[PDB]
Every structure is written in C-alpha cells, then in structure tokens.
Amino acid sequence: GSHSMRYFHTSVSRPGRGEPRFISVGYVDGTQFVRFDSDAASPRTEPRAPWIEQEGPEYWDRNTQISKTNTQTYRESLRNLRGYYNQSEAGSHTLQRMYGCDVGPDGRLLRGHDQSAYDGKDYIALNEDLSSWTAADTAAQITQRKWEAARVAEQLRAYLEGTCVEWLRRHLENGKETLQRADPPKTHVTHHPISDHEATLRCWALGFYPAEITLTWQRDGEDQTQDTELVETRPAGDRTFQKWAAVVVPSGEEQRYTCHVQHEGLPKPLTLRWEP
Amino acid sequence: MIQRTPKIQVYSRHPAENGKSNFLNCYVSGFHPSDIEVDLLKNGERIEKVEHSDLSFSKDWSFYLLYYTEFTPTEKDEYACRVNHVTLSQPKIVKWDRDM
Amino acid sequence: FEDLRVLSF
C-alpha cells in the first residue's frame, strides 16, 4: 500500500527554567524509528525500531548534528516569534514542525509535506506544489518573506523529492517484515445490561496494524453515526492498536445491530453480531 | 492563550486475565500545551518507575503520550490513572475497567 | 536523513 515518513519537532520555551527543550521523533507510518531530546544527559539521535539499528555511524552522527543545530535554531525562532506577536518574556510558547513525504505501492512520490504551528495554531505551511507558502497571519508573513528571499522552498522541494523518498524506500525495505505487514484486528462483541430496558453492545478491534480502521454499528442496515460512542484508536505498546465502538440498544433488539469492520490486514470485511 | 485539555484512556495491552502479568496503559491525547503529569495507581497508590513514550503530536498539533507499566490484574485490585494539566483545576482520575 | 533548515522563523 501507501507509506509515509514523517518527522515531528517540538520546541517549548520555559522562561526561568533554562533554554527551550527540543525534541524530534521520526516515524514510518505508525512506527517510530528515531528520537532526539536536548534534555537527555547526552543528546543523540537514537534508534527506536530494530530495523534502523543497522545504519552506520555516519547516519547517527549526521542526524545528531542536524538535531543539535535544530536545538539552537528553534530557540532563535522562538525568540523571533515572541517578538512577532509582541509577547512578554514571561510566558512559555511552543513551536512545532511536521514534515516528510508519502509514496504509493510503486515507491513513487505521492506528495511532500512541511507545516509549522505556534502555540498549537497553524503558522506557515509549504503548499503541495513544494514551491509556495501559506502564512496564517501577518506574523507568519514575516517568516514567509524571509524564507522567500532565501529560496527555502526550492531547498525543501529538493529534499522532499530526493533524500526524503530515497530514505523512505530504504526504511520500507529494511523493515519490510513489519512496515509492509498489515496485522488484522481480533474482534468480539460484548454485551453489558444498563437497566431492564437497555443494554450496551461494544464492538472491539484489538491487535491491528496500521492504525487506520473503520469500525461502525448499523441498526437494520442503517449507520448509527450519532448514536455510537467511538473511542480514539489507541496504542497497545506492542506496535498494535485497539479501538471499540458502542451502542445503547433496547432490550431484546440486539439482533437488529451489526458491527462492521474494515482493515487492511483482513482477507474480507467483517460483519459481527452479539453471540449469546 | 487557547489550550486543549487531555483525553484519557486507561486499559491493558492484552486481554485481562486474573493473575496473568500484563501491561497497564494510560494514553493521554488531544492536549496543548505539551506539559502534563500522569501517574498510574494501584489501590490509590502511585506505581513507581512507570515508563512513557517520546513526545509527539497529531495532525491537529495536539500532543499524545503513552504511559505504561507491568501489572497483574485481580478481582480485588483497583487500577487507575491520575492526570494533571494546566487546563485542569484538579487532577482527573480515570479508573481502569476491563470492559473499556 | 532529516532535512536541515538553518534559517530561523
């Protein structure tokens, strides 16, 4: 199927408690493979998945250098952003960047991504053309003009279409036994009486990878969108994910309800009912 | 400034089986800013040395973290997660329920 | 490899 490589940068100022912490994590789809933390006793890009461990010293040294430079650049960016919003030196602020590329089943580039946020709100983003910017406000227009003058977008296009995709394809091959393996959900329906006239039906999906899944309830073949309680898909800690969907049903009407499951790992979509 | 309060889920890695070692998870998500305090509790007491994932975030910029520790579920032992964040006046406690 | 942006915001 399709795949992505994404890096997630978070820098957080903490006035009075030293300089802003910088964290970078890298993912291939839902699998983290590297981390860097400027607050670690000895900051270094570290492996977080077994398949990346084979990379040689140059990979670890170069990514550590990029991260150490980023720790400093993001602090300069936070100082600039504070001024662009006329903010006091007393408050804490956050700068985030997420960037990377997507490829299809043939390994060809689908699109690149580069987006940034300040205090959790969209600030500036590279457009899908990898050539122009979208700035959220007059502060981001200052960044945009600065990056336009230095032709940053052309540099980002070259990275996203070159290095980005070359390394995503390399990771997909080195980790193919996991990264290109879809594990289907293990499913079951539970029944929990609430009162004499209603019960909860809960549809479970466990042990699946990747996280994308469709889990719905139907009543007489009609989707129960508004009436379904659907928890966020959550990590189990063994690379897999979990999710459930529940509906409150009238006593005796359980057989009118069907749970539908769609996932890449399944040979066919599932239709489940409560089995007393 | 605009802030987002955490969603909280408490659950086990594997299906719960009384007397079988497993992992107790507390997944916090949807929050901004990233500073957050999470404790795992056994019978109301803080479990020591709980580990957590590396800070990352979702497409809408909100953060997520997984806190986890070994635990052996039983009929009588109570497990929970306690979360504090700038958006909360008091720590929020979510009890572990094997049905959720 | 990661990208490297030396120019601040």
Residue numbers in the entry:
A (entry chain A): 1 to 276
B (entry chain C): 0 to 99
C (entry chain B): 1 to 9
Which sentences from the paper describe this structure?
Our previous work identified NP338 as an immunodominant CD8+ T cell epitope in individuals expressing HLA-B3739. Our conservation analysis of the NP338 viral peptides across vaccine and circulating IAV strains, including pH1N1, H5N1, and H7N9, found 16 natural variants of NP338 peptide, with the most common mutations occurring at position (P) 5, 6, and 7 of the peptide. To understand the molecular basis of cross-reactive TCRαβ recognition, we solved the structure of NP338 and its variants bound to the HLA-B37 molecule, as well as the structure of a cross-reactive TCR in complex with HLA-B37-NP338.
The NP338 peptide could bind each of the three HLA molecules (HLA-B37, -B18, and -B*44:05); however, the stability of HLA-B37-NP338 was superior by 6 °C to HLA-B18-NP338 and by 14 °C to HLA-B*44:05-NP338. We then solved the binary structures of the NP338 peptide presented by HLA-B37, HLA-B18, and HLA-B44. However, the NP338 peptide adopted a strikingly distinct conformation when bound to HLA-B37 as compared with HLA-B18 (r.m.s.d. of the peptide 1.7 Å) and HLA-B44 (r.m.s.d. of 1.8 Å for the peptide). In HLA-B18, P5-Arg is partially buried in the D-/E-pocket and only exposed its guanidinium group to the solvent, stabilized by a salt bridge with the peptide P3-Asp. Polymorphism at position 116 between the two HLA molecules change the architecture of the peptide. As a result, P9-Phe of the peptide is anchored deeper in the cleft in the HLA-B18 molecule, which would sterically clash with the P5-Arg conformation observed in HLA-B37. In addition, the salt bridge observed in HLA-B37 between Asp77 and P5-Arg would be lacking in HLA-B18 due to the presence of Ser77.
